[PDB]
Design a protein around this ligand. Structure first.
Ligand SMILES: Nc1ncnc2c1ncn2[C@@H]1O[C@H](CSCC[C@H](N)C(=O)O)[C@@H](O)[C@H]1O
Ligand SMILES: [Zn+2]
Ligand SMILES: [Zn+2]
Ligand SMILES: [Zn+2]
Ligand SMILES: [Zn+2]
Length: 269
């Protein structure tokens, strides 16, 4: 039995695996964050009451979800010292599901493929063109507390892929770990010159979605990457987004970028 869809039917579109007859190490798929040990906020619970727009579209000035201008353009592309927080209209907003401020919530819109890279283990690539600015995928998994993070990191062995990420927004802190239960974003490799940008996007919950948007046009078969240090295009003091690992060895980076630093920029413990 060859597993056709790495996402197990749980996303809008299947995600294939390559090469034929090869599959990544098993994990439990989830399209969305789930509660993990130490989480104090259930990421599935509604926290935000939404906007009051019902008679006319949600627009800046009148939509309490759009207090910092439109997040997205009409093609659903992300527009664009302190960073403006992004809120989508949510399950409680009475605007229609066509509202231009509903984008991450709509889910995957491209066909991706988990594939064996030359030196980085499995990665994720697109099988189709993705326009600059378009939502690509979340990085979703168990939402953990700080001590649980510490507990898991300290067990990371030498060949372990490291997946926990720490999001700090200035402090709101969110730890997401798709190691055991996670979505397809867990397969994104790091690049020193990546093609995705991660933005914390709030929808129903105070626990943000870690939404990756295309930072440039991405062509078919192009591998999808983001910066594990979270520095790429991160030009405010407001939001650090750091992948964590254990141990003092600096792991080599094989991203191939001209500005490669030669090391994978985990925050080590
Ligand atoms: N630019 C890069 N250079 C070398 N290894 C990388 C890399 N980006 C990601 N990795 C590898 O991928 C791990 C992060 S999880 C990313 C998916 C992973 N390659 C997998 O097969 O499941 C890293 O710990 C490292 O093993
Ligand atoms: Zn509104
Ligand atoms: Zn709204
Ligand atoms: Zn709306
Ligand atoms: Zn690199």
């Amino acid at each position: 039995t060859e597993q056709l869809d790495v996402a197990c039917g749980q996303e809008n579109l299947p995600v294939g695996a390559w090469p034929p007859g090869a599959a990544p190490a098993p994990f439990q798929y989830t399209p969305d964050h789930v509660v993990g040990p130490g989480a104090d906020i259930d990421p599935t619970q509604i926290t935000f009451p939404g906007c009051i727009c019902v008679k006319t579209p949600c627009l800046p000035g009148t939509c309490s979800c759009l207090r910092h201008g439109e997040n997205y353009d009409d093609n659903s592309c992300l527009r664009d010292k302190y960073a403006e927080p992004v809120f989508e209209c949510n399950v409680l907003c009475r605007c229609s599901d066509h509202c231009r401020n509903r984008v991450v919530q709509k889910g995957l819109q491209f066909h991706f493929q988990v594939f064996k890279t030359h030196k980085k283990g499995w990665g994720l690539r697109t099988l189709e063109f993705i326009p600059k600015g378009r939502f690509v995928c979340e990085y979703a998994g168990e939402v953990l507390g700080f001590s649980e993070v510490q507990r898991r990191i300290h067990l990371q062995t030498k060949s372990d892929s490291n997946y926990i990420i720490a999001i700090r927004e200035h402090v709101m802190e969110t730890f997401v770990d798709p190691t055991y239960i996670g979505n397809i974003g867990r397969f994104l490799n790091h690049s020193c010159e990546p093609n995705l940008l991660m933005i914390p996007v709030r929808i129903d919950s105070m626990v943000p979605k870690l939404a990756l948007f295309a930072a440039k046009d991405i062509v078919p078969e192009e591998e999808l990457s983001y910066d594990y240090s979270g520095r790429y295009l991160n030009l405010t003091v407001s939001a650090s987004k750091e992948r964590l690992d254990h141990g003092k060895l600096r792991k080599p980076c094989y991203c191939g970028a001209k500005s490669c630093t030669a090391f994978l920029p985990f925050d080590s413990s």
